[PDB]
Symmetry: C6
């Protein structure tokens, strides 16, 4: 990564942490914040290191390559590289493959990120990767938020855990996820607790709803 | 975080420590000082990293979003952002969502915290999070301090452990918690030790009370 | 803590070490040097972090609050805070609660410790905490040094281990602990080894005493 | 390694990580990105350290020496070292054995990497090693991509895992591996899922193919 | 400790390492180099930290206090502290208790070690501690080098292991330990190997002796 | 060690790593690169620390002292120390015992290594130690390369593993080890694979030989 702006190699324990996350949790949503966390300030090289060091799950990793290539091609469409000799004071325009690290050196990557104005290929490439990771997480979720229904004897606290766990993996904008909260959570509760929450106004927060069905 | 004031990414072992705390202890009161401890000097990004990396407990994490939004809206009410072009020497006013990190970049967050005078969005956001964590801890306590009663054969030392453990999770100002100490601890002791403490003046410290019921 | 004088947050592995010490050893005397060791250069905030992160043992932790308050009130008696506007070049006088960290910010704490002359609230507060920890260790010792008596078949080496272990937890000045060494150790040995040591002059060191009863 | 450009010794936990990788995973493809990751900025000495610290697998390690020697001899052919006294302001031309670290000191290696223009013997030698590691990985793969055939009841997700795992270890340019993707993956699927994918156009991505055979 | 000369607190993992050494190995000779290793550059405070954090083995730790006091009193005899006001440019003369850390502050200890000329109380105190540790190691050795005799079927390699293990814990100058090597090792070998070594000249090295009795 | 050139103490985890290597692997060849790796930039003091912290294996450690003394005496023969007062601008000539660390201080060792021109007692002493370690490794190998013979049903890959493992511990120059490769490996293969390799020209690499006997 790059700290403060002095270059540093990806640490052994960053690597080990990332490797273990995928080993332990496969593609559960929280893997992604962890990914971003362990790659704070990461170069494309550091980002590529993390992806290639994943053993197994190679159907997903292949999917991730495809998504990244789609984003790379789109970058090239909007940002066409121009023909000409790169003058002494400047550095060349990055293509999608330079951003994904496959066709650029670390020094070029260090150059782009540090030059003023900053051209943050690290944060750009990270978005393409995270974009592709969501496609995987969302695909690898077996259940839909529509299927989360409260069991007749399930403590509300546990039903809300399943709902917002499954919700976290859905492909939905904030407004669609907002709609699912205001509609389905109460809609799919079991009759006894469903009634209790209905008596609460139709704009009450989860705290009021959870404490309401705590005894029931 | 930010040390001394040079920016640094949240460390692998900070992350791992925070993850393990929630895995091991759920929402026991001590999780919160640990949270604050592991987030000393944390940016909103670092704070958001920690929250999103929590797997499970998503009913609480949803509650935490709601509390944070309440505090954010309140910030916007008192601090309305003004319309105008941000002059070269200055930086824009932060909204609640900039403080919660959802709508601000790391550089803006670094800018606000370091600019003089300091605008500590990190310490502000941390208070909103801790505010929301208390609501969770307090809700997730099964027992009330009123229900902690000394068993007939329970060593006082163990009864006081249960009392101040349960007390730690109560929603109460210092004065209310002071009242509970001076009233309930002795009130709810078992007859044999209850009598012994009554003979002590009614302003004696826990040391005098614990050593008093040590034999009994 | 503060190193060399640049501020630093309490480290994850300091925290983990302190947490584990209390988990593993409760309040055995050695916990206290460990405490001081892990808090070298600690601010009141860092000191408070360590105390609050202790789960369980809340009867003792409550006792520790009371001791700290006694020391704080005494500080206020000798050092009364004066009324007046704090001039630009100076910083305010710390109260007991500022030293205990409950009513002071980190920057004020950094200010006091670094300003010349140094006002070491960290080392002051640490003494109050250690004072309160001794009250706990000493209270939580089941046995008195007076009760350590050598068994008829106990190797002297093991009897001396029990004596100076139990001695370490006693409330006694160095002179009283010196008296206990010169009186009780030999006094409470078993007849066979007791005689052997009596033949040695009455000012011989533990090395001479231990090697004397090695065969017996 | 060399950071930012200040020399540093290979860390204990780098060493331990590399040792454990070979112990746990033998020569699975991901060992290689890990190798490159743990050797970021590595000198030939640091690279040699990692190779020699491998216990066992000495048939492969011998193969690795042979590959490195082939690359070294080729370096000497294109870059013949010239006879003459090395002038005060300059440093000598590196041979293949200087690049492989066997005949050069750390200071000469530090000199070459830091001198301007940079002569990156570390990154050169690393390529020879990685070249030799691929020969090993590829040789030590038992299966060919041609032999990966979907079982009649195997979930497509698992068949694609085996395909791209085995593909990762193949000796093939990107174009040959591209051909294998577009030809064999669908060709070697089982009849039921093979048909389903055939109905999709013949240019659809893995995401479309995997989601297509998810029910079947 | 003090690095390069900037002060640093004793690290958590130094502490943990030292604690574990005594837990695992009691007072086997190698504990002592470890002690010196973990205390490289240690202040008396850092040295005292390590000693006090030892739980158990308190008969030895008491012995260690006594040895340290003997060395301290001897220091005071040769270096008597003089009466007078310490001038502005100077610092006071250290007593034995200042060197042992019991009566000196860290700053005084930092002052003495860094002032020119250097007054290394750390390295002085460390010698007193190591002096006292040897008395313990040597006392706690059950066996004498005189009692190490080769068993009739013991491989020489194992007999030499026992000899130089037991030798390491003996109270003997280098010349006395040299005499024990040249005399007892061969003297106390078993008849078959004893004869074999006797045929070798009486000045042959352990390598020649060990390889000589390898078959027998 | 010394980094970049600023002095540093040997790290806890270096120590622990070295201790564990000897515990786990005794004197297998790879211990030696590990030794060199963990002692990169090591002073004689740091080198002595590592040797003395080895518990057990004291027959070998004694052998190591003897080898080091032989190399030390040889140093003294070629480099006789001269009589005279060491002038203010200079430092004394190191003897063998100063290089082995037994008769020199850390500062003298820091002085020699840093003074220009550099007098690298660390790298000199390390060679003496490594010299002595090879004598141990080679002695402690039970088998000779001559005795490694392929079993009738042993996969060639496993026979080559045993050959180059055992070869690694042999006392032989590169030319003698080259001869053993070109002669014995094929000579001592089993009849079926021995024939197969004979059909290959008599200058084919291990890759060609291993892939040749892969089916057989
Ligand atoms: Cl994210
Ligand atoms: Cl990629
Ligand atoms: Cl807090
Ligand atoms: Cl949030
Ligand atoms: Cl203490
Ligand atoms: Cl407190
Ligand atoms: Cl690679
Ligand atoms: Cl090599
Ligand atoms: Cl030593
Ligand atoms: Cl002491
Ligand atoms: Cl080596
Ligand atoms: Cl030595």
């Amino acid at each position: 990564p790059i700290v403060q702006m002095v270059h540093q190699a990806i640490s052994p324990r960053t690597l080990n942490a990332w490797v273990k996350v995928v080993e332990e949790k496969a593609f559960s949503p929280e893997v992604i914040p962890m990914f971003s966390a362990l790659s704070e300030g990461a170069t494309p090289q550091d980002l590529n290191t993390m992806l290639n060091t994943v053993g197994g799950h190679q159907a997903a990793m292949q999917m991730l390559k495809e998504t990244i290539n789609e984003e790379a091609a789109e970058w090239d469409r909007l940002h066409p590289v121009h023909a000409g000799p790169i003058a002494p004071g400047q550095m060349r325009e990055p293509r999608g493959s330079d951003i994904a690290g496959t066709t650029s050196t670390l020094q070029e990557q260090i150059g782009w990120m540090t030059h003023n104005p900053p051209i943050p290929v690290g944060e750009i490439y990270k978005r393409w990767i995270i974009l592709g990771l969501n496609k995987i997480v969302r695909m690898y979720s077996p259940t839909s938020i529509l299927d989360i229904r409260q069991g007749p004897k399930e403590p509300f606290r546990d039903y809300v855990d399943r709902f917002y766990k499954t919700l976290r993996a859905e492909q939905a904008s904030q407004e669609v996820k907002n709609w699912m909260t205001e509609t389905l959570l109460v809609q799919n509760a079991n009759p006894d607790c469903k009634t209790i929450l209905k008596a609460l106004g139709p704009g009450a927060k989860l705290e009021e709803m959870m404490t309401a069905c705590q005894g029931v």
